[PDB]
Amino acid sequence: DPFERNKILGRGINIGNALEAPNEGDWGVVIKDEFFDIIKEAGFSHVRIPIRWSTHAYAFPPYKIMDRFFKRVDEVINGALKRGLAVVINIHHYEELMNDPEEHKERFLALWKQIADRYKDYPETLFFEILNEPHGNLTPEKWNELLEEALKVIRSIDKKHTIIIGTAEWGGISALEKLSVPKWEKNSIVTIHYYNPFEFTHQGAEWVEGSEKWLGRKWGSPDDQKHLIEEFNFIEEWSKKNKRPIYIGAFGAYRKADLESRIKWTSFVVREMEKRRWSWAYWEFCSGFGVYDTLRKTWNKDLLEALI
Template sequence: MRRFKIVIVILVSLCIIPVCFSSVLGEIPTVFTPINRSGDAASGLGMRRGINIGNALEAPQEGVWGVYIEDDYFRIIKEAGFDTVRIPIRWSAHAESYPPYRIYDDFLQRVDHVVSKALEQNLITVINVHHYEEIMYDPEAHRERFIAIWRQIAEHYKDYPETLYFELLNEPSYNLVDRIWNELVEETVKVIRESNPTRKIIIGPTRWNSVYKLEALKLPDDENIIVTFHFYTPFEFTHQGAEWVSPSPPIGRKWIGTEGEKKQIRDELDIAVKWARKHGNITLFMGEFGAYSKADMDSRIRWTSFVVKEAEKRGIAWCYWEFCSGFGAYDPVTGRWREGLLNALVSSKHYVSVETDAGSILGAGWYEEGSYATIRVVETSIGFPVTSVFDHFEGLRPEDRLIDTGVVELYVDGPRVIKAVWRKDYTLLLGTVAAVCVIAVVAVFLYRSRVKTK
């Protein structure tokens, strides 16, 4: 009897092991090969494609937010295909709180070093006033100090190359309303022009540099003004899981690239373009855009690539947020770019990806606009005794070409994502169970026959 029980245990185990093994086989990752290639940039400025070195000099102290600017960063940025770097700076934390509001020498020397290293790489270098939170809540009390800080910055850098640009203030908001901001812009630009008559000055609207507040922005009569806006649409996607946002958008939202999703981005960019044309073709600069690392990487790549290409089609210069922190395109630990994000920023190609719950898919990656991406399911039937059988692709469009079972050619006119749908086939499992039952019955019969003969 004991031998009979052992036989049954072995038979059951033989049924279970293939099922477990099948689940492991289903975890083969999607394959893609990013290609790093610079595309065309449409802006009339030398400033076209940039990146922010955020969370460094705009932190309360450089390094406390995890980023200390290394000299080699600027070479890395330049060689990757960028022509511009934006350096956010919290001057207000390094200046006296009483007249004449002197900027501390040691901090100014540190900024000098960083700016010089950027300019040595022939990068257009944007410095701004960043995280001056006090002026947002009490603008009248900080008006004099803000202007004094800019007077010192302008005087100090007056002999620097014209490729050093000034940006007045990052994301004016809260009590710094349109009327007060417009007055402050006019007064500050006059002060800067005393020592820098032709330097580029970047100015943005209120409500965190929103395109929806461009109409309220009043600009000085100055041909060297650039207008900036920031772009994080849809916010629920780009800021999901962001710890500094309250309430924080829930994690898990994807950006697939549906017609509705793409229209939302195009419409918002068009607001900026129409405003710029209405006011004499003012040069536009998308000074910040990016998706936080809590979003899935494929969605971040698709969103970034689409925003970049739509901005460039409209002649909008841009500056990705940011280099090597929570939104970072560069990994400072490995010393390498996150290739998918880098390609999204500097490649002329579009990203094609496939979602799948089983099997292995070939063909995802980067493709030229107007081409076809061949997507192929490596094996259309996998697993034992429960088999996953490829059924169909979801997300195909009329212009796509279905070549064979598990093979499709996708027309690439932007980021594309499709899903490979699988169904479960229990035929082998049922056959295995039936075989086990037959063996068990035979074993019982033989055992009883043997007992009777004794």
């Protein structure tokens, strides 16, 4: 039952700027095995692991995933399962697929055939997230077609694991009403990433064009709160109407935002998601949006309190 699987996910955290970089560590984070003890002890139920499989698979048929990398992902998944954490794995940063979905469709499906084959007998606490933030030439209508093709591939191999399906137009709420999950699939959770107000969460983010113009933006007024509730109500009404559980798989404010606003925004988002019984995963553990200092081995106490 996917709603029971959503309850199993519960509170989570992304270990980002790690396996979704071109190579692990390039973006600042290597997934240490002790991180799983740290995260479980703090109270989280699961970890979300962004993975850029596309740079670790051949470009020509059968698009085989490279041995060393598969072994590494196995090591990470098993490290998390050892502590009783549920685990979400995905395909992240496959830009070629977004820019030309027609050319990369079969390669994308070969990746899922291999990933489902690899993990089909792993525990039910492992979840498969089809694709992080479809966007660009992978339009909402093309994503509805591609996600159904992925579901068919995965289900041809594995009818046990819950699958997580995102929205197009970069994975937020804008294309939620356009999302179509096939009626025949009954064990999926829909995921939405929530970073609104984007100008607040992303102020000064170096990889976002013109974000410097947002530096200093605050968050916390009664009107800021009402706007966010309006958006969460929209998502909740969609969930109720379409009978699909919701997972906010990524949300967080960048370190350049003032700490007090980050705490208020993060704490309010978590209280409001929990009132709607949604599962979620904070973005992210220890990098630019981080809440844990790997050198001092300490959590930012106020941001951790906002989460747990």
